[PDB]
């Protein structure tokens, strides 16, 4: 478990820096305050694991749908990647007990 937490931290830090670099210039022009600082990006992507981060945390108010669609794609890829790392941690924990 403590070896897959490193992979979790790597994917988390990568997507945190990416979405903070994407959404930092829209701090007052979003629906909520997510991804506008490092603290808000942290508490969005952490509670997205347990389903406590809403999907409207990624939309903006302007007509820049380029950056909004980048945010949708990045957030979906983050969720699928986290589910895949969890499903591999489960198989590693099974193999570590069948020995």
């Amino acid at each position: 478990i403590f070896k897959f937490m490193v992979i979790f931290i790597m994917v988390f830090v990568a997507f945190m820096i990416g979405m903070f670099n994407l959404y930092s210039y829209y701090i007052g022009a979003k629906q909520n305050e997510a991804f506008t600082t490092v603290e808000e990006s942290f508490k969005t992507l952490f509670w997205a694991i347990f389903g406590l981060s809403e999907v409207k945390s990624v939309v903006i108010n302007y007509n820049h749908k380029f950056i909004e669609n980048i945010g949708y794609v990045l957030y979906g890829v983050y969720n699928v990647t986290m589910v895949i790392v969890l499903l591999n941690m489960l198989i590693a924990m099974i193999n570590s007990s069948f020995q």
Binding site: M10, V13, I17, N21, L22, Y25, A29, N63, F66
Partner: protein, 191 residues
């Protein structure tokens, strides 16, 4: 004689990748706790230049990132012709590496042409109502076009920053604890 051994070459490459990731972290260091530049306001800090010159000028950290990615494209293009487009394109992580480098290159290409348009508009007209050729400058974030060449750069730069963390898999199978873990991930990725 020590610095040309294989293990020290591996340590030097890992250190250069660590410097590149630290540069990608510390590039957005003025906005960690708040931007202090609202999308409605505008700041020039010189009272002669327009607003689109402050947002398009390359910093020294961006110049270092451009230097690192130019070195990466050079070290990849040196190796694609050594193996040909049969051993290179067959591996599917070379697709991810070439995609990350291409997205970085497209981001810097879009930022350069945005800066070129801004510098041309500031050069041809060096507080009254400006004419209808540089009036789409000195404007806030609301009144940009949806296809502005700076938001294309800012959109591709985030994807490239996410994808650049995938190069940990090139230095990770050298470890006795995270090598078989990567082997198990690659075993299960096919299904």
């Amino acid at each position: 004689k020590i610095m040309r051994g294989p293990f020290m070459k591996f340590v030097a490459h890992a250190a250069s990748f660590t410097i590149f990731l630290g540069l990608l972290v510390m590039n957005a260091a003025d906005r960690f706790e708040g931007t202090k530049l609202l999308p409605n306001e505008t700041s020039t800090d010189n009272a002669k230049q327009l607003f689109r010159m402050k947002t398009s000028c390359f910093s020294w950290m961006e110049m270092l990132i451009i230097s690192w990615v130019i070195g990466m494209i050079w070290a990849e293009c040196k190796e694609i012709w050594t193996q040909g487009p049969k051993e290179y394109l067959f591996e599917l992580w070379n697709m991810l590496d070439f995609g990350m480098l291409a997205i970085f290159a497209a981001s810097f290409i879009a930022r350069f042409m945005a800066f070129w348009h801004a510098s041309k508009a500031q050069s041809i007209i060096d507080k009254v109502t400006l004419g209808d050729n540089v009036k789409y400058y000195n404007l806030a974030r609301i009144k940009w076009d949806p296809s502005d060449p700076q938001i294309i750069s800012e959109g591709l730069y985030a994807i490239a920053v996410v994808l650049s963390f995938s190069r940990i898999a090139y230095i990770l199978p050298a470890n006795e604890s995270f090598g078989p873990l990567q082997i198990s991930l690659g075993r299960t990725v096919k299904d």
